[PDB]
Design a protein around this ligand. Structure first.
Ligand code: ADP
Ligand code: MMC
Ligand code: MG
Length: 253
């Protein structure tokens, strides 16, 4: 059942505003950990911290029982950490394949800082084969040469998860992939989520609320104002924890 990632009271500040007041989690192996909370509670901050993007003012982060606190995102790549980045504008001007090919130009690193080491896209024998394999898996076989701009929101998010796949991570980090989408697509993003969970990959997803994908969740952790206000790790634990009075109040609006 072992744990794979645990923080030790993560704190953060943005001027005078303490965006995180010692956040301690329990991400683990093969689990589909989802952190939800209204906007402002610091959900995308705990992430930039866990990924190294934003520094921990005071606290720790352990992966495989190791201190990775404050390590560079480019450092974490070799530990097993990777994050799903929204595809940039100059990036949406290149095909789906290449958009995953760059996922290796710089692994565990920003699509910006990855493609910025690209003089001419790496059409090496192994990278092509690996990509196209991943393009079939994600059911995005038929779009290998479609510009990424021509991709719907749905077709897009999976090419972004593929880009993050082009490293072969032990854990992937997603910040609101279904947040906003139609219910048909919610299951779609999450479909592959279980298609990769059964391949040995651990997820750290983050959504505003948890409505549609409750039957997937392996572990829930709610957040309000930089802290953890409730937690479930089972269907009834989570249902109760969502339909928990104070927990359904912060979502009245
Ligand atoms: N660069 C920043 N400078 C100052 N405040 C920030 C910055 N980034 C985020 N915040 C603030 O931190 C709070 C919540 O953090 P945020 O990452 O936005 O969490 P969430 O994902 O729940 O919206 C908000 O008040 C937000 O505007
Ligand atoms: C121990 Hg999850
Ligand atoms: Mg956020």
């Amino acid at each position: 059942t072992m744990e794979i990632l645990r923080t030790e009271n993560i704190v953060k500040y943005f001027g005078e505003f303490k965006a995180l007041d010692g956040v301690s989690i329990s991400v683990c192996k093969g689990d589909v950990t989802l952190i939800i909370g209204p906007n402002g509670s610091g959900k995308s901050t705990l992430i930039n911290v866990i990924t190294g993007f934003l520094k921990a003012d005071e606290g720790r982060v352990y992966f495989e029982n190791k201190d990775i606190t404050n390590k560079e995102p480019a450092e974490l790549y070799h530990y097993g950490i990777v994050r799903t980045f929204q595809t940039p504008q100059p990036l949406k001007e290149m095909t789906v394949l290449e958009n995953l090919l760059i996922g290796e130009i710089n692994p565990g690193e920003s699509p910006l800082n990855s493609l910025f080491y690209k003089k001419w896209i790496p059409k090496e024998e192994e990278m092509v084969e690996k990509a196209f394999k991943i393009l079939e898996f994600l059911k995005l076989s038929h779009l290998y040469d479609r510009k990424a701009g021509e991709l719907s929101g749905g077709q897009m998010k999976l090419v972004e998860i593929g880009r993050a796949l082009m490293t072969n991570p032990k854990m992937i980090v997603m910040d609101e992939p279904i947040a906003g989408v139609a219910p048909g697509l919610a299951h779609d993003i999450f479909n592959h989520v279980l298609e990769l969970k059964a391949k040995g990959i651990t997820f750290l997803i983050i959504e505003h609320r948890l409505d549609i994908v409750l039957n997937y969740i392996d572990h829930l952790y709610v957040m309000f104002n930089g802290q953890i206000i409730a937690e479930g790790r089972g269907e009834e634990e989570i249902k109760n924890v969502l339909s928990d009075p104070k927990v359904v109040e912060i979502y009245i609006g």
